[PDB]
Amino acid sequence: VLKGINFDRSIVTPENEASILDLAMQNRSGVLDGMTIDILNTTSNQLALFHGTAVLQGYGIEITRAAAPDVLVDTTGQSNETMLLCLTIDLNQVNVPSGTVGTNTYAVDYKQIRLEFLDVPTLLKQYWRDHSLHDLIDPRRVISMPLYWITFGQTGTTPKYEQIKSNYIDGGNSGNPAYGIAARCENFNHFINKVAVQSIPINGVANRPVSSTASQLTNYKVWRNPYLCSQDPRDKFAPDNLVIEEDGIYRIDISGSINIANYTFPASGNSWRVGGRYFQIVCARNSSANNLAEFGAEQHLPPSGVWTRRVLVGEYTAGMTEQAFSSVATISLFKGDNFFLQFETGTNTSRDSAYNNGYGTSGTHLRNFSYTLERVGDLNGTAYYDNGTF
Amino acid sequence: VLKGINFDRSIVTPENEASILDLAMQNRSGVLDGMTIDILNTTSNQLALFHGTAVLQGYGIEITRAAAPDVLVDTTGQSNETMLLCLTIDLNQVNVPSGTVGTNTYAVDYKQIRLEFLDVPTLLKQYWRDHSLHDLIDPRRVISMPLYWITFGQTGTTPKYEQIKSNYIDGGNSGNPAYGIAARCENFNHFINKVAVQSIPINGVANRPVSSTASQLTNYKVWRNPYLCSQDPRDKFAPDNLVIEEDGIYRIDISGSINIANYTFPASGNSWRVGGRYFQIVCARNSSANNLAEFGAEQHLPPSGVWTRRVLVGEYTAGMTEQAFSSVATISLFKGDNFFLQFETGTNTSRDSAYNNGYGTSGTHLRNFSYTLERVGDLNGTAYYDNGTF
Amino acid sequence: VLKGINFDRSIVTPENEASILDLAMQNRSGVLDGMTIDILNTTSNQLALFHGTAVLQGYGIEITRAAAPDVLVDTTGQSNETMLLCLTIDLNQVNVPSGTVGTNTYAVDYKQIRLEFLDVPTLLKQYWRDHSLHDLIDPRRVISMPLYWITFGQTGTTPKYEQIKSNYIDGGNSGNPAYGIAARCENFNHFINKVAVQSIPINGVANRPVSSTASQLTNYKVWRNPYLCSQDPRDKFAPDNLVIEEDGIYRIDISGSINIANYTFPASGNSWRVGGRYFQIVCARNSSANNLAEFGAEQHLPPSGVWTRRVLVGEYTAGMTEQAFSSVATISLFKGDNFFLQFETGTNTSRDSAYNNGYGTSGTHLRNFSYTLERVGDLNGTAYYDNGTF
């Protein structure tokens, strides 16, 4: 029949108020505060966390302070192994209340909640980002959130640790936790190499023109939201490519200029006209490598006919020393995709190349270049096919 | 007096937890999953829906599975008529509980919830998008959400159906359900007609240059969010105009280039200078036609002094074969408005026109053109006057 | 131990359902409707408000109608003084229930909620925007929201009032209450003064070219969200500078054109080439003045190494009468900062200036200029250092 959830005679359940908080977190789970590692209280038998709060598919979970040490996890038996420390909800277990309201002695042993060590394959089979307690088709009884990589050494030693920042809602994004900026940078300058096609390094090192003959690799400020993207884990592609961690429609903004742009000088032989040189700036996706996403997870396969290159700026050099550009596009991207930006032009510098024959600040370069990448829509349901191919 | 809602001694009601979930849906109602038509179980007496879940002004409503057929609606008496199948909340009715908690036999006949057929005028008088159970000034006791157009034939036949996608939260938008992208497209190329003022077709067919003498009508990928906009229902305007379905401040992004742009060649008679030709790209709203919104609903009237044309790009051709452009603006739009984009230039090709005398790829055209339209703000309360005129 | 909040055996508290609604308001508090001043019922003894509803760190508060006058606040004793009328939650007090459910006589005197007059320093020490009932480190028991400046005259007179619009969720922003547009304007034209560095007036008065010899100060439409920004309160800077009221990552969009742009004409002495003139449009932040934010609150100090100027457009004039530009950037801004936009160029009009020697419509000017500033991210937690310096 038609059932109301929420109406005057309805009873409201645990499962209901959880389904509602999930909705309010934009279906993101994570640590809302604390639950970082407390290394002072961390022996070779035991691993300690600080207090705090997390939401996992709508279920609120707390580690309370008392007495530090806020909570302890048994590590005895773990040795020479990298594991994930995970917070897990297991709805097969029974929570055990004791005592009574009306005294003030009501308390619960929440056996449905545990902190545990999992290997990567086990965590992936029950990872909140891919499976749900509330799922329509394959609903689960157990679901986990990974918090730290824990690499155990020798028995007797205390382990090494690396926070899983994608599962902490830190900062960046309280208010719109599943959306917002994915990556952004400050203005930088980058030397254009003498080739037809090259990537623009978006991951925080540019080849900056520094003198009339040389450029040098120079850090610039960049930020990424680790829930949404990461730097490519292969060094070959690390300067240039992002790995997308979450499916969506994304907005890419770019702006900058091309400085010391090439062009054909007015001779009398061309009727005293500037001969412009064609260039374009494109964004690109590529899903040919699997398992680039966090944990080596399986990539999400894009719909048939999906785009791979899109022109953001396409024009001729105009005969000026410096020429500015800007562009904004929305584009579909998928978990596991590489995303990057390319500069393309001809390679004959006396006929068709936007770049000249100089080096450093005498050679053609991007100046004042910056971008922002932002997640602005999801690709659930029919959007996957209607919106996901471009 | 001062009443707390939520405080230690407060009692929390149905009406309260509903007012709170509404808030969490950004005041959007709709189907959250399922509740599509189940045509296998659908006779000439009866219409069947699949299970699922919806929220209607904060009230959660469920069709449960058991035993398919997940629920049935009596169609007997309906004949040669187009109706709306609607989910309706009627707070004048009594929900009837039976049995007891503490047994496990508590159950409710929710007479406050029904599936029914309404005609368009009746649905409009009680449509959630225009009236509210929670309204300050005119609060209602009955409110509906339309799910399908149902066109009944002859007695004996089974009816035809069309989903009302604006009332399903499918995909596109889980997380920001009342906002997000309204329309977007992939890059396309469009021939510029030899006239002073023309619309740029934004609804998925362009006149693409294909040869040195001809262009041809060619589909390009486009997507629209049917909650926010639709293609104009008049064929005259269907290639070019959107109908806005929801009031708001919207962001319009455009980018592209003008290719084979015209200009006056350096002769000795102009002192060997390029004579640029003025053009502009404008966005436009027009509310002169009423009842373009879904269901023929009444348009929302804009504040006095409202804008109708805004220049996004205004400059001269620069003497290059191809010249790129980009622009981002925020603009007010109202339910029932037409929105479109125009290219404007002079019509004397030897003096003031940005376009030349060629056709197809020899004639002046937009290349790599794309847009995104996004709802970014509402126009409730004082914003209607302070923000709504531009 | 591990505590569940929300699970089958959990008890859900006041404090819990409040922490959850806060989350759903994006941690913004404010008036959701009504609670404006009711001056008809407002004597020299007493101040009257209309009914309505507010949320204060997750606690819902109501003034009910009955019988107008919807509620009264005692003003006796207040004289020749500007005060803040504030809604305050005081969790040290006891709410006093009376009567019984099962009769229909249950009622509560909510002594935890009061309307009161505070001076500015007292309000600031307990202002919801800077302190929280839920705070991790310094949790409070009392918290306030200011609603009106109330300036009391002579005993016998009734007071003057000014609404605190930052604390009313009016309009603009229902759905994304802590984010969305901060400021926006319609297209305007502004004369470029003959100086190296000048601000572009963004606060609704431009110096519009009106004739071949003159410009004139002319209003244009602008809007600001008073939760996020305000016009600078110092007249010296009021045409040009915003004060940021809320920390965040913001997006700035600009577009427009430079009209009657200067350049060096092709003589035979430069080999018949256009000599372009460099200009740039920059956005700027400055935190050197403290206490510009609402109420004279303390500015939030930016991380060490924070940006102060960023180039949005940097290029040469191209020899055309009018040249368009556009740019989009994300930038960090802090409570108390000034934000403004600058046009920079050389000052020798026969060599390096983008501007010429004319005035009014004969002189170089911005045309069709507009902007939008939007809050798109927060700077809580680690984002303050990782994202906040640029």
Ligand SMILES: CC(=O)N[C@H]1[C@@H](OP(=O)(O)O)O[C@H](CO)[C@@H](O)[C@@H]1O
């Ligand atoms: C299997 C593999 O490593 N492919 C690389 C390679 O793609 P191909 O489609 O194989 O060219 O170059 C891409 C960048 O150009 C990178 O994104 C990708 O992961």
Ligand SMILES: CC(=O)N[C@H]1[C@@H](OP(=O)(O)O)O[C@H](CO)[C@@H](O)[C@@H]1O
């Ligand atoms: C009554 C009517 O059909 N008006 C049309 C017509 O507007 P007028 O203001 O009537 O020119 O042209 C518009 C597009 O240019 C279209 O938006 C509109 O609906």
Ligand SMILES: CC(=O)N[C@H]1[C@@H](OP(=O)(O)O)O[C@H](CO)[C@@H](O)[C@@H]1O
């Ligand atoms: C103490 C003071 O008033 N400083 C002014 C002044 O900054 P200085 O850093 O002091 O130049 O000019 C700024 C605008 O250029 C304005 O933002 C600021 O408030």
